[PDB]
Design a protein around this ligand. Structure first.
Ligand SMILES: [Cl-]
Ligand SMILES: [Cl-]
Length: 153
């Protein structure tokens, strides 16, 4: 869809003195979060706070993998805890939108376009030690860092 959040505005709002460390970590490619990867789902939109919520409830009603979600300015990565296998390597430039969940506080998801499959694909998570919004803030820092480096280049 067409719809744009002011990234600067929401950066200034999200100021718990725990997330101060997250921003410098995302830029320095060291930022990680313990998660449970729910899976990917077809979604009818590139963005939507409720569109995500839906996609989460699809998977939560379907049937999860212990992993670590890594957040850098170049992309998001999910590494398996059991096998240490790289499960997901999603580039930050083809990520459309991300958001936490109004009704699942540990939930975090992001939408992305896959040009080969020609569809919008959500990717849901349940954080183990953190809140869903903490993760989303981290990925927003990526969105910012990306745009900022693309402007210099
Ligand atoms: Cl938005
Ligand atoms: Cl930088």
């Amino acid at each position: 869809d067409l719809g744009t959040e002011n990234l600067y505005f929401q950066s200034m709002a999200s100021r718990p003195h725990q997330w101060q460390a997250d921003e410098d970590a995302v830029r320095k490619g060291t930022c990680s979060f313990p998660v449970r990867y729910l899976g990917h789902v077809e979604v009818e939109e590139s963005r939507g706070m409720h569109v995500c919520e839906d996609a989460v409830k699809k998977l939560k009603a379907m049937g999860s993998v212990k992993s670590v979600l890594w957040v850098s300015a170049d992309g998001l990565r999910v590494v398996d805890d059991k096998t240490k296998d790289l499960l997901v390597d999603q580039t930050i430039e083809k990520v459309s939108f991300c958001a936490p969940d109004r009704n699942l506080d540990k939930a975090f998801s992001y939408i992305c376009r896959d040009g080969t499959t020609r569809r919008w694909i959500c990717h849901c998570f349940l954080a183990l030690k953190d809140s869903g919004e903490r993760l989303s803030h981290a990925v927003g820092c990526a969105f910012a860092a990306c745009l900022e480096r693309k402007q210099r280049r």
